[PDB]
Design a protein around this ligand. Structure first.
Ligand SMILES: OC[C@H]1O[C@H](O[C@H]2[C@H](O)[C@@H](O)[C@@H](O[C@H]3[C@H](O)[C@@H](O)[C@@H](O[C@H]4[C@H](O)[C@@H](O)[C@@H](O)O[C@@H]4CO)O[C@@H]3CO)O[C@@H]2CO)[C@H](O)[C@@H](O)[C@@H]1O
Lengths: 506, 11, 7
């Protein structure tokens, strides 16, 4: 990652232009250029890199930061007590993982019901009214309700209303063996969603763009969305209200509450510059104002500015919904939960599965523990000045497997076996301690079979296949006999590993 | 254990 | 085994 520069990653639905303005002010004072980017799937891309060209700062809801901290991707932020007192202590709790602060909290987010005051003067208090309301609106060429059915974030409040939950809290922590995805409450909620689609009140294909376009053109009376969505509605001709989500079975819809958070990349050489920008430029009245102006943040973590914005009824409604909802866990298993429920809702909504089938798989998938160990492997190969005439060897090479992160791989790896071509003596080379590598000379390329064994003999060994590369394929580097580096990134995946093995992997 | 379903990336 | 200068 380039030094004397800040690269920031924020999601494309947030005020990235507003953030850029805070970056320009930072550049004005320090001379340090801030580059704000909104890459697709940044929250999936971040671990793949973070890095070479990974960001200095990453923005997301707090739910994903626990997984990043487990992998060791985040720097422990070091805000002074004077600074911590300026933000709401609730927001600090959301960015804490294993007793340590791993991100700066920016703003509290919750979904609200947004409705067209011209089309729908009195919004419905219940989900159960919406079919009737839609039939009445369909007669006038309009629809009652359209929201993102592709992302479980938007459908969860309905699923959770009558008893759906992610992880049961027990013994002072989230119990990841107790998932609340296929109980009567969850089934009732998703069934109500599936029935809306079966009855033509909603369309399984509806995504963020379609719902937003539909509501903002006055085609649908209602949508479900967060504060970030208000800017585009302002630009439209729609008179909108932000209100409490409809009740289901007489119980409030329970949106998962998000704390938009800024993490500092552990690989960043600009940790001090990141601290300065986040503490003294973004998390200020003027800084949050520039971002909020672009796309509203919700209830900001900075007390001073939250008090200035608190009187906005749209924020009051946001916090009303937040209070009836649940703070998202930040634990690593939240990733698995979100993917499982995304599958369940899309399959149930499309009609590939029944509600019972879809939620039974999600129950299993949400509880499936996956531990990922990124690795690098391959070879370096150096050309001799000239061919050694005795055995015709032209190259010295090292084949190797290394952890991608700076860790002791021998904590979970028992041994690595490198199977060389028959032309070598003792072709089965076994390495029981690091470094996991074999150095040799030769004349020829050939496939090396690499077999990685784990301390738990029941944990199935990983087999890798590597073509030992001696000769450069690039023509200019071929003419120049330049040193060959053929190495590959890969991730070893451990599924529901034994208790012993989980400790060794973490 | 297993390798990720996503193809290996050259570095 | 498939060994050659380039494979
Ligand atoms: O499955 C294919 C899709 O995978 C990707 O989406 C994943 C994410 O990688 C997961 O982290 C998770 O997403 C959660 C998210 O963690 C959580 O914060 C919340 O996201 C809100 C966000 O708080 C809010 O600020 C605003 O941006 O809306 C977001 C919701 O759209 O909820 C998410 C779950 O809906 O799970 C999803 C899988 O659903 C990838 O981003 C997609 O492009 C891809 O299709």
């Amino acid at each position: 990652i380039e030094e004397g520069k800040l690269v920031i990653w924020i999601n494309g639905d947030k005020g990235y232009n507003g953030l850029a303005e805070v970056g320009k002010k930072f550049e004005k004072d320090t001379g340090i250029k801030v580059t704000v980017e909104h890459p697709d799937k940044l929250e999936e891309k971040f671990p793949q890199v973070a890095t070479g060209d990974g960001p200095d700062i990453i923005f997301w809801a707090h739910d994903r930061f626990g997984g990043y901290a487990q992998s060791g991707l985040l720097a422990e932020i070091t805000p002074a007590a004077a600074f911590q007192d300026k933000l709401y202590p609730f927001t600090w709790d959301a960015v804490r993982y294993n007793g340590k602060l791993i991100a700066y909290p920016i703003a509290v987010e919750a979904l609200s019901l947004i409705y067209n005051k011209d089309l729908l003067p009195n919004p419905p208090k219940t989900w159960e009214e919406i079919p009737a309301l839609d039939k009445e609106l369909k007669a006038k060429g309009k629809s009652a309700l359209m929201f993102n059915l592709q992302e479980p974030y938007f459908t969860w409040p309905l699923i959770a209303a009558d008893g759906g939950y992610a992880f049961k809290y027990a013994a002072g922590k989230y119990d990841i063996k107790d998932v609340g995805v296929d109980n009567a409450g969850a089934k009732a909620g998703l069934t109500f969603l599936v029935d809306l689609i079966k009855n033509k009140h909603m369309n399984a294909d509806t995504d963020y763009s379609i719902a937003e376009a539909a509501f903002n053109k006055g085609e649908t009376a209602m949508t479900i969305n967060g504060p970030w969505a208000w800017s585009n509605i302002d630009t439209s001709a729609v008179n909108y209200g932000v209100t409490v989500l409809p009740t289901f079975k007489g119980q409030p819809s329970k949106p998962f509450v998000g704390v938009l958070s800024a993490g500092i990349n552990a690989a960043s050489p600009n940790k001090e510059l990141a601290k300065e920008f986040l503490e003294n430029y973004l998390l200020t009245d003027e800084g949050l104002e520039a971002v909020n102006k672009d796309k509203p943040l919700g209830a900001v973590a900075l007390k001073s500015y939250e008090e200035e914005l608190a009187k906005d009824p749209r924020i009051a409604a946001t916090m009303e919904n937040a209070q009836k909802g649940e703070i998202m866990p930040n634990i690593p298993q939240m990733s698995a939960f979100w993917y499982a429920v995304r599958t369940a809702v899309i399959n149930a909504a499309s009609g590939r599965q029944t509600v019972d089938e879809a939620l039974k798989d999600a129950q299993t998938n949400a509880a499936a523990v996956t531990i990922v160990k990124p690795i690098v492997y391959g070879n370096v190969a150096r050309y001799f000045g000239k061919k050694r005439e005795e055995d015709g060897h032209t190259h010295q090479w090292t084949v190797y497997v290394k952890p991608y992160r700076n860790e002791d791989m021998s904590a979970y790896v028992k041994k690595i076996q490198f199977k060389l071509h028959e032309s070598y003596g003792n072709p089965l080379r076994v390495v029981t301690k690091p470094p996991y590598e074999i150095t040799e000379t030769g004349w020829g390329e050939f496939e090396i079979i690499i077999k990685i064994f784990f301390i738990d003999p029941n944990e199935r060994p990983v087999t890798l296949y590597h073509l030992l590369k001696l000769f450069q394929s690039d023509t200019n580097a071929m003419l120049g006999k330049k040193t060959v580096v053929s190495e590959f990134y890969d991730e070893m995946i451990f599924q529901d590993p034994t208790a012993m093995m989980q400790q060794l992997l973490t | 254990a297993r390798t990720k379903q996503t193809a290996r990336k050259s570095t």
